[PDB]
Amino acid sequence: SGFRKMAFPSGKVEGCMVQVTCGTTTLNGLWLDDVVYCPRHVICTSEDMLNPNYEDLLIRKSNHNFLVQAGNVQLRVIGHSMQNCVLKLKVDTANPKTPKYKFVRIQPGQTFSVLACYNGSPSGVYQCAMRPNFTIKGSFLNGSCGSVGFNIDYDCVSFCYMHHMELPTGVHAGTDLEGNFYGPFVDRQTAQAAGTDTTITVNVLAWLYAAVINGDRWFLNRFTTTLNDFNLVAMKYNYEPLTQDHVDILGPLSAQTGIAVLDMCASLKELLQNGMNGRTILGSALLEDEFTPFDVVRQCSGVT
Amino acid sequence: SGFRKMAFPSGKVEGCMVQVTCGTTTLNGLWLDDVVYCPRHVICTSEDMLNPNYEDLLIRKSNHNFLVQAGNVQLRVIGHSMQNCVLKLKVDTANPKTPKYKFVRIQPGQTFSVLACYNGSPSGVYQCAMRPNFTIKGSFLNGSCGSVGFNIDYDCVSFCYMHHMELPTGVHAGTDLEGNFYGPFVDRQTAQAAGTDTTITVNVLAWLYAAVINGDRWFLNRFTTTLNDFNLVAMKYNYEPLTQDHVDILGPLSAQTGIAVLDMCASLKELLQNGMNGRTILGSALLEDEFTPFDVVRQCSGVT
Numbered sequence: 201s202g203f204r205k206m207a208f209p210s211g212k213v214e215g216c217m218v219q220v221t222c223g224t225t226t227l228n229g230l231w232l233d234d235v236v237y238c239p240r241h242v243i244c245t246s247e248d249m250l251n252p253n254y255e256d257l258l259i260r261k262s263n264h265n266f267l268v269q270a271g272n273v274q275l276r277v278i279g280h281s282m283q284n285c286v287l288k289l290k291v292d293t294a295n296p297k298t299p300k301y302k303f304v305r306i307q308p309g310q311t312f313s314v315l316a317c318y319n320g321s322p323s324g325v326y327q328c329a330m331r332p333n334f335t336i337k338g339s340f341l342n343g344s345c346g347s348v349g350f351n352i353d354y355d356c357v358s359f360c361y362m363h364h365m366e367l368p369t370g371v372h373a374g375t376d377l378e379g380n381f382y383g384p385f386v387d388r389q390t391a392q393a394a395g396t397d398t399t400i401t402v403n404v405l406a407w408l409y410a411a412v413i414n415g416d417r418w419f420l421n422r423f424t425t426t427l428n429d430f431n432l433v434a435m436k437y438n439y440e441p442l443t444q445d446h447v448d449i450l451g452p453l454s455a456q457t458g459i460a461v462l463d464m465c466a467s468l469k470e471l472l473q474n475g476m477n478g479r480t481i482l483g484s485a486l487l488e489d490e491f492t493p494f495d496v497v498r499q500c501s502g503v504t
Numbered sequence: 505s506g507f508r509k510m511a512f513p514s515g516k517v518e519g520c521m522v523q524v525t526c527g528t529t530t531l532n533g534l535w536l537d538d539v540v541y542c543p544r545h546v547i548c549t550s551e552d553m554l555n556p557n558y559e560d561l562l563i564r565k566s567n568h569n570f571l572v573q574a575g576n577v578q579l580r581v582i583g584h585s586m587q588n589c590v591l592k593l594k595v596d597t598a599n600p601k602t603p604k605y606k607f608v609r610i611q612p613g614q615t616f617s618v619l620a621c622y623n624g625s626p627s628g629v630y631q632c633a634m635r636p637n638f639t640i641k642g643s644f645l646n647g648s649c650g651s652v653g654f655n656i657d658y659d660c661v662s663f664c665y666m667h668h669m670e671l672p673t674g675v676h677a678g679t680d681l682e683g684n685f686y687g688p689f690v691d692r693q694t695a696q697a698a699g700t701d702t703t704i705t706v707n708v709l710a711w712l713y714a715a716v717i718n719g720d721r722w723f724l725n726r727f728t729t730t731l732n733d734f735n736l737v738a739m740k741y742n743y744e745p746l747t748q749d750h751v752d753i754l755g756p757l758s759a760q761t762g763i764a765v766l767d768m769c770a771s772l773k774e775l776l777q778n779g780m781n782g783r784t785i786l787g788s789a790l791l792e793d794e795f796t797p798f799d800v801v802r803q804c805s806g807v808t
């Protein structure tokens with residue numbers, strides 16, 4: 201038993217973390233095979249950060265201008281390209297520690313592990329979620345740019361996120377590994393609307409199943425509800441609307457506990473309308489939405 | 505900005521995770537140099553788990569009975585010894601991936617990262633704290649025995665915890681790497697008193713400093729307090745008594761924010777006497793005590 205905000209082991213990812221220096225700026229790069237991926241804002245200076253002409257800024261750059269360092273050994277840059285908002289630097293050596301990897305674009309509400317890095321050195325790892333508004337609530341400081349988010353299935357690392365920017369609101373915005381930002385965000389030091397963020401309902405329901413599995417049952421009740429009635433309650437409390445696909449994904453947890461998904465919806469409806477009344481669920485005084493149904497299954501079954 | 509329950513990168517630790525099989529039982533081992541450390545309850549069977557005679561059970565065992573597996577390759581056991589509640593199996597090969605390591609016994613209130621493993625395979629990593637009552641609130645399933653807790657300074661892994669047991673209350677008990685349990689716990693399937701657990705006050709104060717550093721200031725007030733007055737409040741709310749040593753350790757965070765430790769104590773006194781009033785601090789509706797002053801400094805400064 202026990203329920204923690206568990207991240208994937210970062211080992212396979214530490215072996216890809218490099219330091220990228222361009223001009224006066226240093227950020228993190230992801231060395232996979234003979235390519236180093238990093239945020240394109242490495243070619244920028246403070247003056248041009250308000251609205252940079254990335255194509256023009258990259259033109260004044262040659263392979264020898266980009267300095268890629270892997271721990272201590274210098275990598276030789278033989279090619280440079282800009283793919284959306286990332287630079288792909290072809291290096292003459294393939295990373296001996298490259299794991300089996302995929303570049304995947306996650307959906308909002310999905311979770312992943314983040315390995316925060318500074319100067320190519322990892323400092324920590326935390327599990328987080330792609331918010332419905334495409335922001336992430338991470339922990340990032342200056343120099344954390346280039347830190348990646350990922351998921352791990354058996355031996356394959358699916359890279360899903362690269363950190364680029366911190367919004368004035370303190371939340372974080374970044375891209376997939378092909379350079380496409382999640383959300384409407386652009387790599388300019390300009391004020392940007394993060395958007396209205398909602399609560400990932402299916403994740404809160406999955407965490408309620410995780411609570412029952414781990415002994416917390418006080419929130420269970422003699423009531424049930426329909427998808428329609430629950431969705432009216434969810435709309436009032438800024439929760440993502442529940443669909444039959446969400447109910448289907450909660451099938452495994454519903455079968456393990458023997459609690460129908462609409463009976464768990466009725467418990468969540470009561471928790472929303474009445475609050476926690478000073479109590480806790482899994483050590484928390486608020487409803488948690490950063491555990492997908494898959495995360496709860498993995499943690500309560502012990503998939504390695 | 506941002507404040508997460510960040511764990512150390514698990515890379516250096518994954519390279520030491522082995523699988524130990526003895527008889528019908530399988531648990532995790534820590535392969536450092538030519539020794540594999542694991543919980544001694546690997547030599548037990550269900551019948552003798554109520555009160556095992558470990559000395560007698562180990563006598564019926566020879567080096568060839570212990571099966572140590574590192575990923576896929578089998579290790580050759582040339583020596584076996586029992587040190588308190590851990591077995592030290594001398595293997596003929598030194599772990600090529602052994603990091604610079606220390607075996608340290610942490611104090612209650614200290615934090616560490618845990619790499620949960622099953623069959624020698626890591627599954628996740630989470631940051632947690634040694635509770636004042638010497639239990640840990642981890643996430644462990646059957647087969648998680650042998651999973652270690654650690655801290656990392658530069659390149660040195662300080663191993664501080666080895667998981668042995670889950671108490672009937674769902675909390676976890678384990679040992680240091682010399683086989684000494686933290687707390688009064690023994691490796692027997694017997695009901696054991698976990699003890700009264702208190703809230704690590706200096707950690708809650710450190711997290712309040714982390715809240716101010718990251719924009720959350722609603723809890724700050726026009727009041728101050730003495731060590732004595734604050735300690736009366738802490739006693740009523742089952743918080744660890746604050747000492748001048750705790751105040752001294754909060755010196756760096758007090759200097760960064762410019763908020764005197766006794767003014768932050770007065771804010772905590774109000775939060776305890778009045779609750780959060782439905783609000784949150786760093787995304788939480790309760791007072792957090794699993795971030796030491798060092799953790800807050802590391803996370804808000806970016807030590808790699």
Ligand SMILES: COc1ccc2cncc(NC(=O)Cc3cccc(Cl)c3)c2c1
Binds near residue numbers: 249341364365
């Ligand atoms: C300067 O202080 C910080 C603190 C925390 C930080 C956390 N994440 C990122 C940082 N910097 C940037 O976002 C730099 C930047 C600016 C505009 C557009 C783009 Cl793509 C990048 C951070 C800086």
Ligand SMILES: COc1ccc2cncc(NC(=O)Cc3cccc(Cl)c3)c2c1
Binds near residue numbers: 201646648649690693
């Ligand atoms: C059998 O199910 C579980 C579930 C979660 C579990 C989480 N941690 C540990 C487990 N097992 C034990 O503690 C085995 C045991 C028993 C008595 C004394 C000692 Cl030293 C060891 C777990 C078992």
